[PDB]
Design a binder for this molecule. Structure first.
Ligand SMILES: NC(=O)c1ccc[n+]([C@@H]2O[C@H](COP(=O)([O-])OP(=O)(O)OC[C@H]3O[C@@H](n4cnc5c(N)ncnc54)[C@H](O)[C@@H]3O)[C@@H](O)[C@H]2O)c1
Ligand SMILES: NC(=O)c1ccc[n+]([C@@H]2O[C@H](COP(=O)([O-])OP(=O)(O)OC[C@H]3O[C@@H](n4cnc5c(N)ncnc54)[C@H](O)[C@@H]3O)[C@@H](O)[C@H]2O)c1
Ligand SMILES: O=C(O)[C@H]1O[C@H](OP(=O)(O)OP(=O)(O)OC[C@H]2O[C@@H](n3ccc(=O)[nH]c3=O)[C@H](O)[C@@H]2O)[C@H](O)[C@@H](O)[C@@H]1O
Ligand SMILES: O=C(O)[C@H]1O[C@H](OP(=O)(O)OP(=O)(O)OC[C@H]2O[C@@H](n3ccc(=O)[nH]c3=O)[C@H](O)[C@@H]2O)[C@H](O)[C@@H](O)[C@@H]1O
Lengths: 375, 367
């Protein structure tokens, strides 16, 4: 039964990038908590093998992998035509190669999505596009003098979806390649919703954290790979190295437990009366920390989870030239405004930062420790 | 002879959107002041008809025309002006705007990089969008620090409205194309230069509605106010015309572009603000100043109230938002090409409105 009060008609859902971090967890909540049928499209299925017929036949029927690459594969339009609802996760989304493979980044996050949008509008299918909190980029507050009082006015850091600006660095700062592409795709989807009648919903994850995020370098992922902080630190703690802090890890972020976030997405799927039209911050404003804090807190939790204790210095500073490369720039403070999502879907994040790290690092320890020993 | 000191080897130049406002004036400076050969590509040639009986029109639409890649290969240097650039239909045809300013340019960029041709892409000062200063409280002292309103090309941010503010459709597309061109210059070896016009003003800009274009069309402020003065109506000021802009005489600007063409040792790599920081006014001021000049130029005098306020809902439509203050920086351009705008605002309006009066007045009477 939906929020409006109506009963929930089941759906065939075309999920693109469904073998990803967010994809995989979504498949789980859909299978376990709902009637819906999933078409899982991705180039890899590693993270959903545990749910495919070969590894199990408990969900034979209601999920179907299709190894497709949407860059060029005729098969796609038909697969879309096959479903009632398309969810597009398929994207390069590691900051690491926004300034290093800027063309592939732009093509990934803008160009390769356009077809998906063509087909949804043509065939009158509903679209859920996954954008990012990086679309807001920098916080107006960030340009005020150090410790200027205006920084304390929420006016200057809260990121409201209907009115806060999209602020990026100059062109030479190639990290914004990703954000600018995401901005344009949102603008296009919104328009297509306006010029044409596209039913759509756009999701801006603020730093979703849980298992399967990215990869541990050398194990599941590569050796010279560079993921996103959770994965990065995770590796540091497992390998018993210190945690590399980029320019002293003074940026801030707000982390939300992946489970909390998936509930949000579900509410959107099942209440199109209230999600069609809108853009949604999915984040947990209460779990804010600096990156240095995330690191400290993660070492503490990890010691709890591991048994094994501290490290001499558990962190170290490193220049962004050294770490990220040439044209790095950074989002300074993500704090989601929860008026729109709260009003439309009644959503709120239940889970604490400490709690979600206890959860996530136990998954990390139980998965990667016998492995990282044999290496 | 170039700035570096070298002599200038002549060039075949592929100019796309060459029958446009900027296109047309460029063809003139190339023909009259230089050795270069021009390939003029456009769907329309109306504004180059006068100089058409070293220049070769090709009625080509770049959206889909095989002919293009060969035309590009035909030249040494490509200049891409071809773009929807009227604020009017950024919030009203957002798809066509985005496709125009991002997607349709991509092929041009494919061919230039593939075939090792030099590219000059015309972007815009909108790419900066809003000034950081715009978010400080009314009359907050920090607004006076140039830190908060000058738009430096290598470091100032691109600040746009939320998504629902569809005017930024245009700016975001232009931003991404710049980012891609710059990326292609980095990942691949593309020789390129990007131009950010700040409000270039002069002769064949846009159209007069009902004479040079659609009766219900809506161009840029020069053309809009030009029509108001010619038709003897008041000048419609959008939300009291309190935004500011800096206008540069079209002739001054074209000199800049030429310097870039003829001095690749200094222009390859860079992004350039072409504007004239000294000619800043609010829109209300531009209107006042234009009515004054026009009275001078026309003979005919004032109007009772010569302006009137109008809501942007009423004027521009649904998702309008606005660049608040353009004031270009010039350190880069000035350092690379030695360029500076000679011409005054009043002077350039005396010039432009005399062209307007001599062109549109017998016409507007007969209507
Ligand atoms: C935000 O949140 C969204 C999802 O984040 P996430 O943490 O699940 O990322 P993720 O990378 O873990 O999930 C995305 C999935 O999309 C897939 N993908 C990328 N390009 C593809 C293509 N051409 N064809 C098929 N699959 C492709 C990837 O292989 C990956 O499995 C992203 O769109 C991001 O931009
Ligand atoms: C800034 O400065 C630049 C030029 O400004 P302007 O005032 O000269 O504009 P303008 O329109 O006066 O000049 C651009 C020209 O490009 C042409 N054009 C647009 N789409 C085309 C296509 N598919 N094929 C061929 N020609 C096409 C138009 O017909 C127009 O003549 C723009 O890029 C703008 O974004
Ligand atoms: O998960 C998200 O919601 C967002 O995460 C990333 O953006 P970001 O958070 O800036 O980048 P991360 O690499 O996760 O790290 C956060 C910040 O911590 C720092 N960091 C990261 C990694 C590390 O090992 N050390 C470190 O100090 C950097 O400032 C980095 O920008 C993606 O760019 C967005 O697409 C995505 O929506
Ligand atoms: O000339 C430029 O360099 C830029 O001009 C336009 O941007 P913009 O200046 O915002 O818009 P205009 O319609 O030219 O008018 C400027 C402002 O004057 C006001 N206006 C305009 C017209 C009118 O009749 N009345 C009026 O009050 C509005 O604030 C309007 O945005 C384009 O957005 C840019 O592509 C271009 O590079």
């Amino acid at each position: 039964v939906d929020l409006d009060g109506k009963p929930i008609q089941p759906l065939t859902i075309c999920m693109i990038g469904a073998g990803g971090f967010i994809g995989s967890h979504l498949c789980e909540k859909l299978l376990t908590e709902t009637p819906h049928k999933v078409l899982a499209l991705d180039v890899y299925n590693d993270k959903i093998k545990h749910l495919l017929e070969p590894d199990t036949v408990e969900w034979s029927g209601r999920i179907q992998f299709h190894r497709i690459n949407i860059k060029h594969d005729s098969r796609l339009e038909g697969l879309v035509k096959m479903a009632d609802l398309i969810i597009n996760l398929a994207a390069i989304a590691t900051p690491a190669d926004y300034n290093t493979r800027p063309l592939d980044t732009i093509y990934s996050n803008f160009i390769d999505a356009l077809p998906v949008v063509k087909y949804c509008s043509e065939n009158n299918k509903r679209l859920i596009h996954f954008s990012t909190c990086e679309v807001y980029g920098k916080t107006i507050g960030s340009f005020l003098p150090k410790d200027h009082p205006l920084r304390d006015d929420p006016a200057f850091y809260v990121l409201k979806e209907d009115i806060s600006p999209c602020i990026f660095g100059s062109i030479e700062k190639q990290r914004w390649s990703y954000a600018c592409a995401k901005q344009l795709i949102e603008r296009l989807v919104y328009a297509e919703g306006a010029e044409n009648g596209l039913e759509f919903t756009i999701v801006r994850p603020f730093n979703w954290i849980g298992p399967r995020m990215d990869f541990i370098p050398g194990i599941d992922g590569p050796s010279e790979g560079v993921p996103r902080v959770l994965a990065c630190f995770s590796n540091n703690l497992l390998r018993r190295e210190p945690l590399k802090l980029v320019d002293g890890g003074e940026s801030q972020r707000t982390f939300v437990y992946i489970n909390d976030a998936i509930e949000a997405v579900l509410l959107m799927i099942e209440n199109p009366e209230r999600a069609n039209g809108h853009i949604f911050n999915v984040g947990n404003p209460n779990n804010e920390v600096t990156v240095r804090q995330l690191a400290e807190m993660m070492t503490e939790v990890y010691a709890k989870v591991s048994g094994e204790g501290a490290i001499e210095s558990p962190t170290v500073d490193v220049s962004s030239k050294e770490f990220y490369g040439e044209g790095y720039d950074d989002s300074d403070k993500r704090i989601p405004d929860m008026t729109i999502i709260n009003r439309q879907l009644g959503w709120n994040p239940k889970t604490s930062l400490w709690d979600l790290l206890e959860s996530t690092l136990t998954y990390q320890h139980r998965t990667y420790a016998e492995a990282v020993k044999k290496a």
